[PDB]
Design a protein around this ligand. Structure first.
Ligand code: MG
Ligand code: ZN
Ligand code: ZN
Ligand code: ZN
Lengths: 97, 388, 113, 49, 194, 196, 140, 263, 47, 49, 133, 66
RNA sequence: GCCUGGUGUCUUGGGU
């Protein structure tokens, strides 16, 4: 089955549903339900699907590198000023963005 | 500045690291920068007015950094997709398919020139494929001179046997082509092709000579064979057109049936879709399959000698859809992922009546570019084109 | 601004020899002849003539770049004959054929006059 | 001015293709070649040159 | 630990096929004569059959291959895909060895069985990504090359070395040295702005 | 007039061009690969129509949305002694040997655009600087220097050419020497170098 | 005269020939639409000529109905950059920049609308003899 | 052994068949006549007055293209090889032109027939602008209206077409061989039937068609080359063919000289 | 030097008979800005 | 000229709308930032006085 | 002085794909299950169906840099009409007596099928093929 | 601007045939026939005369600037 | 008798 809209926690508990394999394309919700390591795999799956769709192929290590940066703090750091410049990096580096 | 000084060469926008590679200067008359043609691809350069930038290192330390890290042969394989980003292109790629056809033969007098055109040639003329009644070499033998020894590559296209009736696949043993037309699948930029293989076995220096050797042989041979294209090559014969016209005529009838069913409540609803979405979806699938079917008919009728077919088959420019649109049917025009909208009240143009959902009303261009477009079709084509 | 002088196609600089012969010692009895300030016009004429001689085993030429009026010819002969001598023979043959050819045109021309 | 800036020893012009150049070569117009320069240090091995 | 320019799609041959086709390809039976190695490819064929001590190695070989296939099919590559980007392409290295040493011939090979099994097993300890004797490093070093070791063992299996590739003593020692040298060359270089 | 634009790649004198049997040589050779993916079929038809037009002596009417067909133009052309699709046998100029393929050949209207190379070529060794930044000035008309932008910076990082990047942005541009105080770290030092 | 608002309420035939029904099978020429959704049409107006939908720049293109649509846009831009003879009094005007082609020729393939744009009287280009061929590889 | 058969002839074009030679020799003769047969042509224009509507170098450019009688040019030296100080009578011809329109109405057309030879290497027949008849005004150079004057001095020099196309004595050179394609050097493009769709050569009746049974003679070579040399009147057609052969001889002779001197 | 910027005619070489102006006269080798093509040439003083 | 800007992406003022037929040219429009916003009157257009 | 010799009847001549090459299949008149598949140049050596062809395979024509043959010397090829030189690229040690030998003459391909006793000597690096009549 | 001296493509002189061409058009000959009478047989030469535009007649109308 | 300075801020139109 596939749904419009999400409620990952409640749907997992429903008898009949294989509770060990249910997947959502909102990784923000995955983080709240399954934790940071599951978010890593889900983030990778969603990026790869985008790139591979128009037949392109990017070697694993590049997409892997991007998602480790996005999950190293334990929460999702967006690639915007609100994420990037909340780091303990030097002021000259941060002000250049 | 003098011969063999390294300089950094660069075209904007610098989207990835092979936008900046080190080249060796050769001073020449006339005011343009000259590039060997096989580097146009990584720069995404062409010669329609593009400009490029050159930077000269100013010390002993940076000259060495350029030649040992940034130099062109080191950049042949890119880390982006573990495959080459440079291959044989355009004229040389079109020509190398023609030259390595099974029935290309070259007499002795021309063969001697071609061997001498290879800078890396060892001076040993190879024995002709035919000794009697007249010495004749095949194209595959002379191309093989440009490939260094010790190179083995095997590829199977469509489960071919070692007897290769269709002259497809590829087999290379000790740097000599046993069988197989050489096309985009072997000397293009694809992974696992010829260029990738020479790089692993021989290193970047030898692999850089491979580009130069192949180019000098093929462009000479192609100069004396010639190649052209004309208006004749877009024209399918009268028998094929009636097939073409029938498949489009029958597709317009099926679209009529769909309109009838949807208006008489006899149409199946697709999951997740309203009636009008389902209706619009089914019509679009029918019309795109109609053009592909008509395109397939036009393609198969074209003889092997037809010049449009030779470029499509080589992979050097063009694809199936281009044969289809020049000769058979331009097909459905799309805007914002949907058919042409009713920008007038309930109609697409003031030359139609309201509530007309037929193919011609909502942007199906029946004619080919050869035949010429009608005025209604023309505007719709300009709408789709503008969006691009 | 960077166009070269057009007269440089045929006028020889004083420090530049019209003709230069070097050996190709990698194989026996092979020379490289570099022709300065010449074209396909001269080169193709010599090449075919040479190829019909029985003692020439290899002859070829290339114009390496059309923006420079030169070409280089490679000539290998069998052990008996010396390549440079064979080139002289090819030259004299063609001068003779053109002398004959000029004569026969003159005769035919007066008849139509 | 700091993350990027204008620089000396640069040049720019229209490009053309040439099949009779090696892969790693670039043909450079004479006029450009007389304006750009490289500072070569004088040693015992090149002083005569 | 690898550089992106140095990998190519290679097939890992212990993943596809049925258990029967697998067993046909990899198993050596020194008891049942018709399921042993063909006699015309080895010189020492007489001293082979019946040897229980040589059968202990070949059993340990096949048991190792069974572990790999079970690990890869149930944990690593659940969907059965067996073509994957991997370092240093063994197929090309072998067919080059066939050319240098003219490895045509039915001339029975002088390459003994214990040289093969011990040769390959010793190779997998020299594929150094990280050096140092610390206990954690050795675990990390073994983990980094787990997939590649399976790839090597799937190719340099006893039956394939002898029946299919037909290597002799000179060529096989060369193949081991080349794999060892090229794997080192395929490591990413420190300082790379990845 | 069909969006098929190009720059001159080389020039050839009269006798090196390919020629037709009548001794007509082209003024200009464009590339066959420009046609199939761009699908400028009108360019070919214009060539065909203009061939007919120059033989019979009039300017063909090429207005869009008329009854003129390719076959009608082709019929006229064959009746004048030329192959009906516009092809002609041609001969290689270097050797005199025939080309194995025949070449589409005929008049086409070409237009000279304003972009000429001697209006674009530019080089700078050293030269004038801005008063404010002491960096090279902007623009061809002022002997300016090319911009080493943010994206070119990134490419040199990817190459790992750290030494080259340092030199470009200092010695080859606006390098300056300052004095600092080892205690307070400010550029407040007053340095008279002849008095030391 | 009709404007955009009144155009919404009228029914326009594309050419005079479409005003009357007809009695072909020429495999080269273009297919005319069937128009079988309405049984009988009641036309109120007719286009004077459909080629007048183009503007000044696009009217210089011979056969625009045979081109992929972006090429007509690209030529409409480039046409404004092509040297010709911008006026006949160039010797007495002192403009910042002016370009005059030495030997303008009128094109062998023209359109009817060019008569009024004066293009044959002030042409901007030359008829080159063109071979489409792969020659030395200096035209890739 | 080379044979020639002249099919037609007149002052400014010779049509001829060339036979029993190699393809390369026929082609080298074609190239030599276009590119290396010397002629005489204006190469320096001194404008003392030009008040016409045409730009100075525009008029000068047209002057360079005017064909001049070049019959005795072989005895004349190149300017670059003459031992003299500036020009003189041995290396140049001087021409002068002066036109003017008096009257407030009408247009004075300046024609190439107003070019007056002033000096020249007497008594060699060189330097007069070529004329068809005696009442032929010749080539249009300029047009003048009331008070506009053109007074120029032109220096004509010996040159070859390699330097600039104005020195070429030929126009087109028609050239073909093997009208029925017996050698199979071309592979014909066709839609339905190759023979009906390709026109016949204008020399189709000078050779016999291939017989319907006939096998392919893989030893046959090209052997008959029909060519027509048109000229601009700067040289007569018979002179161009003769001097083409002569010029090609000295070039080969010069190569032969250098080998016997380099030892 | 007394001959800079004065008009000059060339009496030997490939540019014999052409007008020019002395642009730079450092020593032995002059720089004449030729009138006829837009080029400034290096030339010896004997010419 | 339509004075909408360069601020505001989308497509609606830039698209060739159906009602442009016969009033502005379907082909003539600049490349780049002004694309689709600057238009040109068809040959037979007029403007009400 | 040769490695193989036999006479073949031509069963099929496939033109189709090319104008100058045809594929021929033949079976030995004297020994069935010995089959020959061979590409040949049409214009130089036209063959028809049911033609009898003597096919010899040698590893040398003597009774590295190719030279135009002198008219004075003499080789095995003086008595044949059509000679080709090629590379053996597959030696199939097949089932009971199914042996196939694949040779490439510059992309003109040959498959020779037959028995071990007839073809054991053909395990060579290079082969000439000589065709008579 | 004014009739070119030479055909661009082949070099045959055509600058002496412009006056003869205008006179033939007054006598009612068609363009193709007029070119035929002048012996301009190759179509490279024909384009030169058929498509030239004579602008110099317009520039002369601007009353001389001395 | 060596050194040797010619603007900026915008706007608009273009090129890839
Ligand atoms: Mg571009
Ligand atoms: Zn301080
Ligand atoms: Zn003199
Ligand atoms: Zn002409």
């Amino acid at each position: 089955l596939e749904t419009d809209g999400i409620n990952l926690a409640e749907v997992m508990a429903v008898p009949g549903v294989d509770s060990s394999r249910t997947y959502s394309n909102s990784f923000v919700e995955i983080l709240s339900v399954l934790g940071i390591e599951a978010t890593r795999s889900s983030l990778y799956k969603e990026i790869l699907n985008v790139i591979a769709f128009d037949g392109s192929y990017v070697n694993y290590r590049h997409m892997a590198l991007l998602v480790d940066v996005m999950t190293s703090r334990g929460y999702l750091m967006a690639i915007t000023r609100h994420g990037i410049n909340r780091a303990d990096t030097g002021a000259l580096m941060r002000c250049s963005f | 500045l003098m011969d063999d000084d390294p300089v950094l060469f660069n075209r904007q926008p610098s989207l990835h690291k092979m936008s900046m590679m080190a080249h060796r200067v050769k001073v020449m008359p006339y005011s343009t920068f000259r590039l060997n043609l096989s580097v146009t691809s990584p720069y995404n350069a062409d010669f329609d007015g593009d400009e490029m930038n050159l930077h000269v290192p100013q010390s002993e330390e940076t000259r060495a950094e350029l030649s040992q890290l940034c130099a062109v042969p080191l950049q042949i394989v890119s880390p982006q997709s573990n495959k080459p980003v440079m291959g044989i292109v355009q004229d040389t790629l079109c020509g190398v398919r023609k030259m390595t056809l099974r029935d290309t033969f070259i007499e002795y007098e021309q063969v001697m020139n071609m061997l001498f055109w290879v800078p890396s040639w060892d001076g040993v003329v190879p024995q002709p494929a035919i000794l009697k009644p007249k010495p004749l070499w095949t194209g595959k033998q002379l191309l093989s001179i440009a490939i260094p020894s010790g190179i083995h590559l095997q590829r199977t296209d469509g489960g071919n046997s070692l007897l290769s009736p269709k002259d497809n696949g590829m087999l290379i043993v000790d740097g000599k082509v046993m069988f197989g037309v050489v096309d985009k699948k072997t000397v293009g930029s694809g992974g696992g092709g010829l260029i990738h293989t020479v790089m692993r076995e021989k290193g970047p220096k030898i692999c850089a000579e491979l580009f130069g050797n192949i180019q000098k042989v093929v462009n000479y041979w192609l100069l004396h064979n010639g190649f052209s294209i004309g208006i004749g090559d877009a024209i399918a014969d009268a028998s094929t057109m009636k097939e073409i016209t029938h498949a489009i005529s029958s597709a317009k009838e099926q679209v009529q049936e769909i309109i009838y069913k949807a208006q008489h409540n006899e149409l199946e609803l697709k999951p997740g879709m309203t009636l009008r979405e389902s209706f619009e979806g089914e019509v679009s699938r029918t019309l795109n399959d109609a053009r592909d079917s008509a395109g397939r008919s036009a393609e198969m009728n074209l003889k092997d000698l037809n010049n449009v077919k030779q470029m499509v088959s080589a992979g050097s420019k063009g694809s199936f859809i281009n044969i289809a649109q020049m000769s058979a049917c331009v097909g459905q025009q799309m805007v914002e992922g949907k058919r042409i909208a009713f920008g007038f009240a309930d109609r697409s143009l003031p030359h139609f009546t309201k509530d007309d959902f037929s193919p011609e009303s909502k942007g199906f261009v029946e004619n080919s570019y050869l035949r010429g477009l009608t005025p209604q079709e023309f505007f719709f084509h300009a709408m789709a084109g503008r969006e691009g | 601004m960077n166009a070269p002088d057009r007269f440089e196609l045929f006028i020889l600089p004083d420090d530049v020899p019209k003709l230069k012969i070097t050996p190709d010692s990698r194989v026996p009895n092979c020379i490289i002849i570099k022709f300065e300030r010449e074209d396909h016009t001269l080169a193709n004429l010599l090449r075919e003539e040479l190829a019909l001689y029985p003692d020439v085993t290899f002859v070829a030429y290339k114009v390496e770049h059309p923006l420079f009026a030169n070409f280089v010819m490679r000539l290998q002969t069998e052990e008996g004959t010396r390549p440079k001598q064979a080139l002289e023979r090819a030259c004299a043959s063609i001068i003779n054929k053109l002398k004959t050819l000029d004569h026969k045109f003159n005769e035919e021309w007066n008849i139509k006059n | 001015n700091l993350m990027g800036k204008r620089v000396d020893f640069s040049a720019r012009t229209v490009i053309s293709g040439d099949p009779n150049l090696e892969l790693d070569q670039v043909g450079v117009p004479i006029s450009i070649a007389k304006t750009l320069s490289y500072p070569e240090t004088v040693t015992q091995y090149n002083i005569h040159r | 630990g690898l550089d992106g320019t140095q990998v190519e799609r290679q097939t890992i041959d212990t993943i596809p096929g049925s258990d029967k086709a697998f067993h046909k390809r990899y198993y050596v039976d020194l008891m049942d004569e018709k399921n042993s190695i063909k006699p015309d490819v080895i010189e020492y064929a007489a001293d082979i059959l019946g040897d229980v001590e040589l059968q202990k190695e070949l059993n340990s070989e096949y048991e190792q291959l069974v572990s790999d296939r079970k690990f890869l099919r149930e944990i690593v590559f659940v969907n059965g895909d067996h073509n994957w980007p991997l370092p240093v392409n063994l197929r090309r290295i072998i067919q080059n060895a066939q050319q240098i040493f003219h490895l045509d011939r039915a001339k029975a090979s002088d390459l003994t069985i214990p040289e093969i099994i011990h040769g390959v097993r010793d190779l997998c300890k020299k594929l150094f990504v990280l050096r140092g004797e610390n206990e954690l490093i050795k675990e990390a070093q073994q983990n980094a090359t787990s997939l590649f070791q399976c790839l090597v063992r799937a190719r340099l299996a006893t039956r394939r070395i002898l029946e299919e590739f037909r290597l002799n003593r000179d060529a096989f020692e060369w193949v081991l040295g080349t794999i060892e040298a090229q794997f080192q060359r395929s490591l990413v270089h420190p300082g790379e702005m990845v | 007039r069909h969006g098929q634009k190009g720059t001159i790649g080389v020039t050839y004198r009269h006798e090196d061009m390919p020629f037709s049997a009548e001794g007509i040589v082209p003024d200009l050779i464009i590339n066959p690969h420009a046609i199939p993916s761009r699908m400028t079929v009108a360019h070919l038809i214009e060539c065909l129509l203009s061939k007919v037009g120059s033989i019979r002596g009039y300017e063909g009417d090429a207005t869009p949305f008329t009854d003129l067909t390719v076959d009608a133009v082709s019929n006229l052309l064959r009746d004048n002694g030329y192959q009906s699709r516009g092809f002609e046998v041609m001969y290689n100029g270097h050797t005199g040997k025939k080309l194995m393929a025949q070449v589409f050949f005929g008049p086409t209207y070409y237009q000279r655009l304003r972009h000429m190379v001697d209006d674009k070529i530019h080089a700078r060794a050293r030269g004038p600087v801005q008063v404010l930044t002491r960096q090279p000035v902007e623009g061809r008309s002022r002997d300016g220097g090319l911009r080493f932008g943010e994206m070119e910076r990134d490419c040199m990082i990817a190459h790992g050419a750290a030494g080259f990047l340092k030199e470009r942005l200092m010695e080859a541009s606006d390098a300056f020497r300052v004095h600092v105080c080892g205690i307070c770290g400010l550029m407040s030092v007053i340095a008279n170098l002849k008095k030391n | 005269y009709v404007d955009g608002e009144e155009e919404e309420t009228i029914m326009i035939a594309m050419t005079p020939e479409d005003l009357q029904t007809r009695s072909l099978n020429d495999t080269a020429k273009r297919i005319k639409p069937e128009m079988s959704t309405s049984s009988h049409h009641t036309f109120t107006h007719c286009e004077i000529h459909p080629s007048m939908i183009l503007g000044v720049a696009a009217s210089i293109i011979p056969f625009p109905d045979h081109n992929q649509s972006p090429r007509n846009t690209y030529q409409s831009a480039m046409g404004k950059q092509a040297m010709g003879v911008f006026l006949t009094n160039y010797n007495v005007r002192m403009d910042t920049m002016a370009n005059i082609l030495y030997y303008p020729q009128k094109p062998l393939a023209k359109t009817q609308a060019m008569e009024y744009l004066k293009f044959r009287e002030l042409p901007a280009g030359q008829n080159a003899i063109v071979a489409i061929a792969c020659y030395s590889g200096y035209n890739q | 052994e080379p044979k020639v058969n002249i099919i037609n002839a007149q002052d400014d074009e010779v049509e001829l068949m060339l036979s029993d030679v190699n393809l390369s020799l026929a082609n080298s003769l074609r190239r030599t006549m276009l590119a290396e047969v010397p002629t005489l042509a204006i190469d320096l224009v001194e404008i003392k007055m030009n008040t016409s509507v045409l730009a100075d170098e525009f008029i000068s450019h047209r002057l360079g293209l005017i064909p001049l009688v070049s019959e005795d040019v072989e005895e004349m030296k190149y300017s670059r090889d003459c031992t003299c100080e500036d020009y003189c009578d041995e290396c140049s011809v001087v021409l002068e032109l002066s036109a003017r329109h008096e009257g407030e109405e009408g247009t004075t057309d300046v024609y190439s027939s107003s070019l007056i030879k002033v000096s020249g290497p007497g008594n060699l027949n060189v330097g007069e602008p070529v004329r068809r008849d005696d009442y032929d005004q010749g080539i249009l150079l300029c047009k003048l209206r009331n008070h506009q004057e053109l007074n120029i001095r032109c220096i004509a020099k010996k040159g070859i077409a390699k330097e600039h196309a104005k020195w070429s004595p030929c126009s087109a050179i028609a050239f073909e061989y093997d009208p029925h394609n017996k050698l199979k050097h071309t592979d014909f493009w066709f839609e339905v039937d190759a023979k009906k769709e390709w026109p016949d050569s204008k020399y189709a009746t000078w050779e016999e068609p291939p017989k319907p049974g006939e096998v392919f003679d893989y030893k046959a070579k090209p052997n008959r080359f029909y060519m027509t040399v048109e000229t601009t009147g700067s040289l007569k057609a018979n002179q161009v063919f003769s001097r083409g052969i002569k010029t090609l001889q000295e070039k080969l002779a010069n190569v032969l000289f250098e080998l016997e001197n380099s030892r | 030097d007394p001959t800079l910027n004065k008009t000059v005619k060339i009496r030997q070489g490939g540019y014999k008979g052409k007008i020019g102006i002395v642009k730079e006269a450092n020593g032995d080798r002059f720089r004449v800005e030729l009138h006829n093509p837009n080029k400034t040439i290096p030339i010896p003083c004997s010419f | 000229n339509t004075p909408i800007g360069r601020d505001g992406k989308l497509a609606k003022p830039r698209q060739l709308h159906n009602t442009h037929w016969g009033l502005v040219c379907p082909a003539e429009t600049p490349e780049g930032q002004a694309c689709g916003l600057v238009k040109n009157l068809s040959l037979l257009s007029g403007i009400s006085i | 002085s040769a490695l193989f010799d036999d006479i073949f009847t031509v069963q099929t001549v496939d033109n189709g794909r090319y104008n100058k090459v045809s594929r021929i299949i033949g079976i030995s008149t004297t020994n069935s299950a010995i089959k020959l598949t061979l590409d040949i140049n049409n214009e130089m050596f036209p063959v028809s169906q049911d033609d009898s062809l003597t096919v010899t395979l040698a590893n040398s024509l003597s009774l590295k840099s190719w030279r135009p043959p002198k008219p004075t010397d003499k080789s095995l090829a003086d008595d044949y009409d059509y000679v080709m030189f090629g590379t053996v690229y597959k030696f199939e040690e097949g089932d009971e007596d199914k042996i196939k030998v694949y040779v490439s003459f510059g992309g003109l391909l040959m498959c020779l099928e037959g028995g071990y006793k007839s073809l054991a000597s053909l395990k060579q690096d290079n082969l000439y093929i000589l065709i008579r009549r | 601007m004014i009739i070119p001296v030479r055909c661009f493509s082949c070099g045959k002189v055509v600058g002496d045939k412009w006056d003869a061409y205008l006179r033939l058009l007054e006598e009612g000959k068609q363009e193709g026939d007029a070119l035929d009478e002048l012996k301009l047989k190759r179509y490279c030469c024909r384009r030169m005369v058929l498509t030239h535009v004579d602008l110099i007649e317009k520039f002369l109308r601007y009353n001389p600037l001395e």
